[PDB]
A paper describes a structure:
[name] (NA) is a receptor-destroying enzyme that cleaves SA, facilitating the release of viral particles from infected cells. Three mAbs—[name], FNI17 and FNI19—stood out for their binding to a broad panel of cell-surface-displayed seasonal and animal circulating IAV and IBV NAs. Collectively, we identified broadly neutralizing NA-targeting mAbs with unprecedented breadth to seasonal and zoonotic IAVs and IBVs, which can synergize with anti-HA stem-directed mAbs. Owing to the functional constraints associated with the SA receptor interactions, the key contact residues of the FNI mAbs are highly conserved across IAV and IBV NAs.
To elucidate the structural basis for the [name], FNI17 and FNI19 broad neutralizing activity, we determined the cryo-electron microscopy structures of their Fabs in complex with NA from [name] A/Tanzania/205/2010 at 2.9 Å, 2.3 Å and 3.1 Å resolutions, respectively. The overall topology of the [name]–NA complex adopts a C4 symmetry, with each NA protomer bound to a Fab. Structural analysis reveals that D107 in the [name] heavy chain complementarity-determinant region 3 mimics the interaction of the sialic acid carboxyl group with the three highly conserved arginine residues (R118, R292 and R371) of the [name] catalytic site. Although the analysis of the static structures shows similar binding energies for the [name]–NA and FNI17–NA complexes, the MD-derived total dynamic binding energy predicts that [name] is a stronger binder (−370 MOE (molecular operating environment) kcal per mol) than FNI17 (−250 MOE kcal per mol) for NA from the [name] A/Tanzania/205/2010 strain, in line with binding affinity measurements. The interactions are balanced across more residues in the [name]–NA complex than in the FNI17–NA complex both in the epitope and in the paratope, providing a possible mechanistic explanation for the superior binding of [name]. In N2 NA structures without the glycan, there is no clash with the antibody and the 242/252 loop adopts virtually indistinguishable conformations in both bound and unbound states.
Numbering used by the authors:
A (entry chain E): 1 to 130
B (entry chain F): 1 to 110
C (entry chain G), D (entry chain L), E (entry chain J): 82 to 469
Amino acid sequence: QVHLVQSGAEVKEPGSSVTVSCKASGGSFNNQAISWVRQAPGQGLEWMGGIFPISGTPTSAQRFQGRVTFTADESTTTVYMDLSSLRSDDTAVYYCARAGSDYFNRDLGWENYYFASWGQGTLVTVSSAS
Amino acid sequence: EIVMTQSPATLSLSSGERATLSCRASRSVSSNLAWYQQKPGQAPRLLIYDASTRATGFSARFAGSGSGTEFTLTISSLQSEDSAIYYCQQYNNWPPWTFGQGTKVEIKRT
Amino acid sequence: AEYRNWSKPQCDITGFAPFSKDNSIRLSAGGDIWVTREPYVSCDPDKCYQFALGQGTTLNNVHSNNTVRDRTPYRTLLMNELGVPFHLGTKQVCIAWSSSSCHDGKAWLHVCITGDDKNATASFIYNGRLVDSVVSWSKEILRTQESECVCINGTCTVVMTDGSASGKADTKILFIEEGKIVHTSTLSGSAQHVEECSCYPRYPGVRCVCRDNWKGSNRPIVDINIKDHSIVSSYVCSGLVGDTPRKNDSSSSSHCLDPNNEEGGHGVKGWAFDDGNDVWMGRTINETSRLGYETFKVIEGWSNPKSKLQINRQVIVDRGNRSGYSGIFSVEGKSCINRCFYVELIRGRKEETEVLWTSNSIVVFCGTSGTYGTGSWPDGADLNLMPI
Amino acid sequence: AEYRNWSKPQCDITGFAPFSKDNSIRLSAGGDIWVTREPYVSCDPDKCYQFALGQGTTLNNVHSNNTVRDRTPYRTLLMNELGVPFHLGTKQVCIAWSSSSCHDGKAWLHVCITGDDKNATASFIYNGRLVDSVVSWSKEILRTQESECVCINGTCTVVMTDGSASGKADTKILFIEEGKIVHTSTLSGSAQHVEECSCYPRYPGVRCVCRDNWKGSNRPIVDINIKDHSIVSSYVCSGLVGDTPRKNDSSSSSHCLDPNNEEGGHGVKGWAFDDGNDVWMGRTINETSRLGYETFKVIEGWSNPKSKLQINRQVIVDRGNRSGYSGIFSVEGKSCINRCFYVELIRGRKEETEVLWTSNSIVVFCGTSGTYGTGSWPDGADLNLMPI
Amino acid sequence: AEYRNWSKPQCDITGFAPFSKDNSIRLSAGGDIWVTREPYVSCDPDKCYQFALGQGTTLNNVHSNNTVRDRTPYRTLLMNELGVPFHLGTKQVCIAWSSSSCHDGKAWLHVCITGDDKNATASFIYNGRLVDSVVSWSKEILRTQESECVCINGTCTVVMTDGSASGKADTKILFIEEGKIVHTSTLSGSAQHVEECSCYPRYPGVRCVCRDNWKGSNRPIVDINIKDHSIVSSYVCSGLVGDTPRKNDSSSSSHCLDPNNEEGGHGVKGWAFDDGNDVWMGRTINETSRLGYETFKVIEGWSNPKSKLQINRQVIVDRGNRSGYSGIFSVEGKSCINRCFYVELIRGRKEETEVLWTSNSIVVFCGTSGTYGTGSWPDGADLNLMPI
Ligand SMILES: *[C@@H]1O[C@H](CO)[C@@H](O[C@@H]2O[C@H](CO)[C@@H](O[C@@H]3O[C@H](CO[C@H]4O[C@H](CO[C@H]5O[C@H](CO)[C@@H](O)[C@H](O)[C@@H]5O)[C@@H](O)[C@H](O[C@H]5O[C@H](CO)[C@@H](O)[C@H](O)[C@@H]5O)[C@@H]4O)[C@@H](O)[C@H](O[C@H]4O[C@H](CO)[C@@H](O)[C@H](O)[C@@H]4O[C@H]4O[C@H](CO)[C@@H](O)[C@H](O)[C@@H]4O)[C@@H]3O)[C@H](O)[C@H]2NC(C)=O)[C@H](O)[C@H]1NC(C)=O
Ligand SMILES: *[C@@H]1O[C@H](CO)[C@@H](O[C@@H]2O[C@H](CO)[C@@H](O[C@@H]3O[C@H](CO[C@H]4O[C@H](CO[C@H]5O[C@H](CO)[C@@H](O)[C@H](O)[C@@H]5O)[C@@H](O)[C@H](O[C@H]5O[C@H](CO)[C@@H](O)[C@H](O)[C@@H]5O)[C@@H]4O)[C@@H](O)[C@H](O[C@H]4O[C@H](CO)[C@@H](O)[C@H](O)[C@@H]4O[C@H]4O[C@H](CO)[C@@H](O)[C@H](O)[C@@H]4O)[C@@H]3O)[C@H](O)[C@H]2NC(C)=O)[C@H](O)[C@H]1NC(C)=O
Ligand SMILES: *[C@@H]1O[C@H](CO)[C@@H](O[C@@H]2O[C@H](CO)[C@@H](O[C@@H]3O[C@H](CO[C@H]4O[C@H](CO[C@H]5O[C@H](CO)[C@@H](O)[C@H](O)[C@@H]5O)[C@@H](O)[C@H](O[C@H]5O[C@H](CO)[C@@H](O)[C@H](O)[C@@H]5O)[C@@H]4O)[C@@H](O)[C@H](O[C@H]4O[C@H](CO)[C@@H](O)[C@H](O)[C@@H]4O[C@H]4O[C@H](CO)[C@@H](O)[C@H](O)[C@@H]4O)[C@@H]3O)[C@H](O)[C@H]2NC(C)=O)[C@H](O)[C@H]1NC(C)=O
Ligand SMILES: *[C@@H]1O[C@H](CO[C@@H]2O[C@@H](C)[C@@H](O)[C@@H](O)[C@@H]2O)[C@@H](O[C@@H]2O[C@H](CO)[C@@H](O)[C@H](O)[C@H]2NC(C)=O)[C@H](O)[C@H]1NC(C)=O
Ligand SMILES: *[C@@H]1O[C@H](CO[C@@H]2O[C@@H](C)[C@@H](O)[C@@H](O)[C@@H]2O)[C@@H](O[C@@H]2O[C@H](CO)[C@@H](O)[C@H](O)[C@H]2NC(C)=O)[C@H](O)[C@H]1NC(C)=O
Ligand SMILES: *[C@@H]1O[C@H](CO)[C@@H](O[C@@H]2O[C@H](CO)[C@@H](O)[C@H](O)[C@H]2NC(C)=O)[C@H](O)[C@H]1NC(C)=O
Ligand SMILES: *[C@@H]1O[C@H](CO)[C@@H](O[C@@H]2O[C@H](CO)[C@@H](O)[C@H](O)[C@H]2NC(C)=O)[C@H](O)[C@H]1NC(C)=O
Ligand SMILES: *[C@@H]1O[C@H](CO)[C@@H](O[C@@H]2O[C@H](CO)[C@@H](O)[C@H](O)[C@H]2NC(C)=O)[C@H](O)[C@H]1NC(C)=O
Ligand SMILES: *[C@@H]1O[C@H](CO)[C@@H](O[C@@H]2O[C@H](CO)[C@@H](O)[C@H](O)[C@H]2NC(C)=O)[C@H](O)[C@H]1NC(C)=O
Ligand SMILES: *[C@@H]1O[C@H](CO)[C@@H](O[C@@H]2O[C@H](CO)[C@@H](O)[C@H](O)[C@H]2NC(C)=O)[C@H](O)[C@H]1NC(C)=O
Ligand SMILES: *[C@@H]1O[C@H](CO)[C@@H](O[C@@H]2O[C@H](CO)[C@@H](O)[C@H](O)[C@H]2NC(C)=O)[C@H](O)[C@H]1NC(C)=O
Ligand SMILES: *[C@@H]1O[C@H](CO)[C@@H](O[C@@H]2O[C@H](CO)[C@@H](O)[C@H](O)[C@H]2NC(C)=O)[C@H](O)[C@H]1NC(C)=O
Ligand SMILES: *[C@@H]1O[C@H](CO)[C@@H](O[C@@H]2O[C@H](CO)[C@@H](O)[C@H](O)[C@H]2NC(C)=O)[C@H](O)[C@H]1NC(C)=O
Ligand SMILES: *[C@@H]1O[C@H](CO)[C@@H](O[C@@H]2O[C@H](CO)[C@@H](O)[C@H](O)[C@H]2NC(C)=O)[C@H](O)[C@H]1NC(C)=O
Ligand SMILES: [Ca+2]
Ligand SMILES: [Ca+2]
Ligand SMILES: [Ca+2]
Ligand SMILES: [Ca+2]
């Protein structure tokens, strides 16, 4: 089946950076956008950004725009998300998800940007503790 | 930018009865609206899209309604597995793709 | 023949009078007409020409289905004299999904962009032959003005952008002489996003008013120096703002240096120009959709950021009828430079689901020092009757 | 190049010989042809052009239904060389539901009218660009000649009217130089209603013969002075009268100064010109409907109000076939100025209910000093067979 | 005006940028477009023209059936400005089932061939009138370049062949002045079969790269002297060979003097040109069918027969999309001579049995000293939907 598979959980010190990755089990990166959404403990869902796997246009939410970058490789069939300048508040589950959207129009923007299928979620926590 | 307001905050009802959830957008989102269910300790799951059509995992007991600025979800004959948190999300043309704050359902058994 | 220099003063405008209309969608219901979007107008010393980006198909044709996408290998730049509709005898001048054109007083320059989204090419065609080319510098949809360039003493200028629509992007100004690129300047000053500029000669320099897709509903300004290639930028001061979407006139605000952060994201291509401390501008009549079109003057609106005093309003298309992109062009008269503008009248998908196609008509108006009355000039096709 | 001055004498006319025909309605049954009304002809120094007011649609088209109304936002002025039919490659020169055009020896002037009935605008377009504009002065359908203007030494003149069709109205004569309005004169003398003038150069001045919708079935005359902008007016003396409707030739009368008050209300656009004390003129063959068309000379008919002595009759369209508007134009020869005329051949609604559309063909004739025979040249389309 | 002499140096090419595309088959599904094959491009001093051999029919027409045969009495040479598609208003310049054209700086020469297979005639038409003619010398399908001729100081040259496709044949070079044949030379040197040459000015001479249907999958070369009418010939040295069919790049070989005898029989029209000891060339991406199209430079490939070191590859049409004939043309710039090429995009019978017709689109590219990105520009018609 197509389904997304994520990298394992992490502890990182404040001021560090983290890499999370997401791979398609079916090898089937068509141009439907892969998106990152996070969930802090006992709190609502938050969209961070995404990328089209073939056409390669990345996009990022305003609160994260200086801190985050996205990149993709068809060969590993994997999308990589890097989050920089970490703080305690970034402690959350990070999910990759696949959007209904597969083209960006210069003038009209995006269409069908809802999340059809989700990865397992990766827990990242930011702390000094061993 | 576009703000999603969802109500009630918590709902509790017995099994075998109808339940209803509501969502409002600070500007008209013209049917570009989806609903998600999240069961405890799991990734979310898509329940409805375009305010009106239900995903493969869910049956005729789930129904979507509304347009423009106000939207509604209804569950018919509530069952043990429905105990979950539900969220609305808009996708009207341009970022960011804001979610509602969510509604929790817990079942009023004996 | 000699190069253009635009060194005459600007004409005393009191408003705008009708000049031209194409009737393209009404003719398409019984005739072979091209599918198009993103039109513009430009003039040689003798007469005016209409340009558009074709979709590689006529309208009553199986290939007219799904014509909503903006970038494909089949898009070409169409060119005609103003008022001749785009029939099968129309010339295709270059391969392009984005473009600009201008006439330097001796010959046409066309700037044409095509290729893959993340590795696109720009070709410079001058006096009928390819003279130069350049490649996408930020690998994320290289794009240009969808409107005329401006040339003074043989040097043409064009604005080009690469990078994100909802974040920081890379913008450069290219200086061109008989098709050869001679200099390049990076954007400077306080404008933070710059797309789809509309530009006009303002001797000795050039001035441009642009689209901000990121944070402004006020419009950016770019001033260009032709003698030393220097650049500066800012925003249109007027409290009545020109972008769509926007807040209503009761609650909108602006800033001379910064994006106003009111309904900032997304936008539409438009225009404005200075008249001492006053500003003339055009906008959609509706605040959140491309319906209707109006123009007016704002008193002190070029220099006072709190002014909301409008006068000389004209409706061009009434609030029930679709509009689209709009842009300025300049025409040299016997003793002054006049300003004129055009409006794209979009029909079909995604809003009008009676048909499978998307296309446009146009309408064109010019500045007058005389007097004028009232009307409305919409597209006028009946999509309930004509071919699906 | 130099401005026109028309200072040659008038040619010795013995009658009219055939010059051109368009076949528009017959071609429309298998081809993409424009829907039109109110045609006219005018010439530059090298060749002649045909003009018409389009209805913004081809004939075999859903938009061809209800094409009977005279004023809509979609009407444009079409222009072609004489004898090329109005196919999809035709140029639209301006937005207009009423117009006039002329060539001054260096470039074209077009006068174009559009807008709301009670607040309309007139645009003046010269050498391809808008130069001036004016607004309705009486707020009740501003209108002009539907035929060529006349220019001497660079000054063009046009007649314009605002106000009622069945009462007193406001008429002005505008003097124009390279598109700029330089002077305006109010109508003077004994003409009481003046519509749709047909005008000809008569050096050093200009002379016009017009339509009276109010009280005359005799036609008004207006003489225009180009050196001092003065105006005078009167009526065509001939006892054989040129308007439709009218009384029969056994019982009609005329007056050199006043409307004859015979079947006075309503009318049709037409022409006449002086030949010493004689007059040449054309009219419908039927007295109460626009059927057939004839021309003749009336002996002393320019100066004697009791004369009914006609000679040199020619039938152009026989009494069973529809006609419409008609008008004069002038052509400069090697040693004299010749006079020529055109006739509109109207087909379809409201009279011919076999179809949903209304449109026209034309036919054109020129003055000869030689000899000629006989014929009839009707429209020749079969409305029982072609598309509804 | 003066005759062309091409005495400027060759431009510093780094690769090829897009210049033009016709969209003919997509337009044909709703429009009257000619059926064609064997296109080419050529330029006068002001602008470029597209040529093709018509099949005497439009595509949506009963006469479009069985359009696969190459020789019939109805074939004519079509001519348009580059980028205007072949609609019904296109000029037919001569009767022809094989042709070549060029402009000498004062007027066009066309060379046109028609008649019976075993007794054919060649006509020479110059400045719009027939000046000379010649007859088949070997009585077995007289034929010529299907691409532009070349002219220096008023003398044009054309290559012509008569005789077998799978054995020894008779080839001559004709020297022509204002349409009059002035000299004729027989082919000399080691080239053993010579068809469909692509030729370019290389002052003081002319150079041609051709098709070998008999024994080479390496391409023949012919060098022509304009001052003494002498001829020499050889083969393209490069180990990467340009004909189709051919062996794969792992196992292909070449020889500077002889046909390589690898997959030698049959072929396709193509091009190559020298750049010091390097060679630029284009070929089909597939080795045994006319699918895709690529270009590249081969290091030392003009002089070293063992070299396989390629650089600067570009895909023009990707491996899943049909191609056809291709050929060079030359354009004079301000300070150097540039090289450009075109590709025929064949659709329909015999491979695509969804339709009864055979026809082509084109796409055109020019040499650049600047920079460029990536793409693919196929034909883009959907034969499953459009008329059979
Ligand atoms: C036929 O065609 C012609 C040409 O097209 C038509 O004429 C044109 O009509 C439009 C109508 O929209 C005019 O534009 C409008 O102009 C006014 C501003 O001008 C008015 O106010 C001036 C200022 O008045 C104050 O100050 C003076 C002292 O300086 C005091 O004396 C006053 O008491 C006031 O306190 C005033 O100077 C003007 O007078 C001049 O102009 C008129 C003609 O309009 C002449 O009769 C006068 O003699 C004199 O020369 C004039 O009174 C703007 O207010 C309009 O914008 C508002 O209205 C829009 C809709 O109409 C709306 O969409 C805008 O958002 C805006 O509304 C907002 O702002 C208002 C205040 O500005 C609020 O009150 C309102 O609630 C809202 O919040 C508009 O810009 C053209 O100027 C005029 N053009 C020409 C060349 O004359 C004609 O109408 C047509 N006729 C017919 C029958 O179709
Ligand atoms: C082939 O083609 C040619 C060219 O197209 C055709 O020739 C043209 O034919 C038409 C016929 O309609 C002519 O127009 C008509 O002209 C007459 C007027 O001319 C006649 O009368 C003149 C005056 O006669 C009186 O006075 C003289 C003295 O001065 C006396 O001698 C007489 O006895 C009379 O009392 C007279 O001078 C004319 O002669 C000249 O012309 C003829 C050619 O016509 C020559 O043979 C002569 O040699 C000489 O040169 C001539 O006899 C008008 O009367 C006509 O109008 C009336 O008729 C119309 C229909 O025809 C009708 O609709 C009008 O209303 C009008 O009728 C009314 O008025 C009448 C009196 O005027 C009443 O009697 C009547 O009841 C009614 O009340 C018309 O204008 C053209 O002039 C002629 N053109 C040329 C250049 O020759 C030719 O016919 C064609 N041939 C064929 C076979 O198809
Ligand atoms: C966006 O658009 C641009 C412009 O279109 C794109 O750029 C273009 O990309 C293509 C890719 O095909 C390039 O053409 C190819 O070029 C190489 C030859 O060049 C490479 O090797 C050079 C030699 O290297 C050896 O020797 C040196 C010392 O001299 C040593 O250091 C090395 O280690 C090696 O031992 C080397 O000099 C080149 O470097 C230069 O160029 C690159 C850019 O390519 C720069 O980064 C460098 O800084 C430097 O300037 C370079 O590394 C050929 O090998 C290619 O042909 C092979 O591949 C084809 C498919 O790609 C295949 O079909 C051919 O048959 C052929 O393959 C065969 O041969 C191979 C060896 O040649 C075998 O390994 C193989 O198995 C097989 O048998 C091809 O010609 C263009 O040059 C380049 N154009 C420009 C102007 O830059 C860009 O890719 C686009 N980007 C995106 C993301 O879309
Ligand atoms: C119209 O103008 C003429 C002069 O000719 C015009 O100007 C020329 C330079 C050239 O452009 C011509 O083609 C134009 O037609 C006037 O004639 C002159 O009148 C004055 C005063 O009587 C006299 O001094 C001149 O000698 C006259 N010249 C000639 C050639 O006769 C004429 O009066 C003007 N007519 C009108 C009605 O305005
Ligand atoms: C081609 O012709 C040139 C001469 O120029 C041509 O004739 C001119 C009148 C004009 O029509 C130009 O546009 C043409 O190109 C030849 O050059 C001359 O060669 C002779 C002999 O060596 C010498 O005496 C002259 O000085 C040369 N003139 C120049 C201007 O260089 C040239 O040799 C011809 N080349 C070929 C290949 O035929
Ligand atoms: C801009 O170009 C115009 C020409 O279009 C220049 O005007 C000409 O100047 C020369 C030299 O003084 C005169 O001989 C001509 O008579 C002028 N022509 C016209 C039509 O006025 C003008 O000088 C240029 N402007 C600048 C700043 O150089
Ligand atoms: C455009 O070119 C004109 C010349 O055609 C320039 O005007 C000249 O400027 C120099 C330096 O000041 C003077 O020496 C000349 O006398 C000027 N000539 C005229 C006719 O004014 C002009 O400066 C150029 N403008 C721009 C913006 O490049
Ligand atoms: C202009 O915009 C403001 C801001 O949205 C509108 O003010 C709001 O009006 C609604 C009712 O329509 C109220 O529910 C809000 O409480 C108001 N907000 C504020 C901050 O006042 C205003 O109505 C708009 N004006 C017009 C004419 O539509
Ligand atoms: C501005 O334009 C919008 C969209 O074209 C208008 O929105 C429509 O409003 C009516 C009721 O007034 C609804 O029936 C439609 O469903 C709305 N359409 C959409 C897509 O939301 C709006 O009314 C206009 N408002 C103003 C003040 O001009
Ligand atoms: C009307 O215009 C004509 C030109 O079309 C004038 O005739 C020319 O007059 C000049 C000056 O005498 C002569 O040099 C030309 O040879 C004349 N040309 C021709 C063709 O005759 C004429 O003078 C003008 N009329 C008036 C009244 O000014
Ligand atoms: C010309 O017009 C007059 C006036 O209408 C006609 O004379 C009348 O004829 C009718 C019969 O057709 C009588 O009933 C009237 O009494 C007549 N009136 C007068 C005042 O005489 C005359 O018949 C018409 N001539 C032609 C040839 O039709
Ligand atoms: C003048 O034209 C009118 C209208 O075209 C003719 O009137 C028709 O006459 C016939 C009988 O002769 C009737 O059957 C029609 O109904 C009439 N039509 C109308 C609309 O009234 C008239 O016959 C013509 N008369 C002359 C003398 O030419
Ligand atoms: C080739 O033709 C060009 C013209 O296109 C010749 O160049 C001209 O040479 C003459 C004589 O020296 C000069 O007067 C011109 O100014 C030159 N014109 C240009 C545009 O440079 C050239 O000489 C010819 N080449 C040969 C070899 O004869
Ligand atoms: C070269 O082109 C040929 C013919 O277009 C290709 O042949 C096809 O190969 C596939 C399997 O790979 C078969 O299913 C088809 O039946 C073949 N078609 C024909 C007509 O034989 C070939 O694959 C291409 N090869 C390369 C390396 O490009
Ligand atoms: Ca047809
Ligand atoms: Ca904006
Ligand atoms: Ca009357
Ligand atoms: Ca071969």
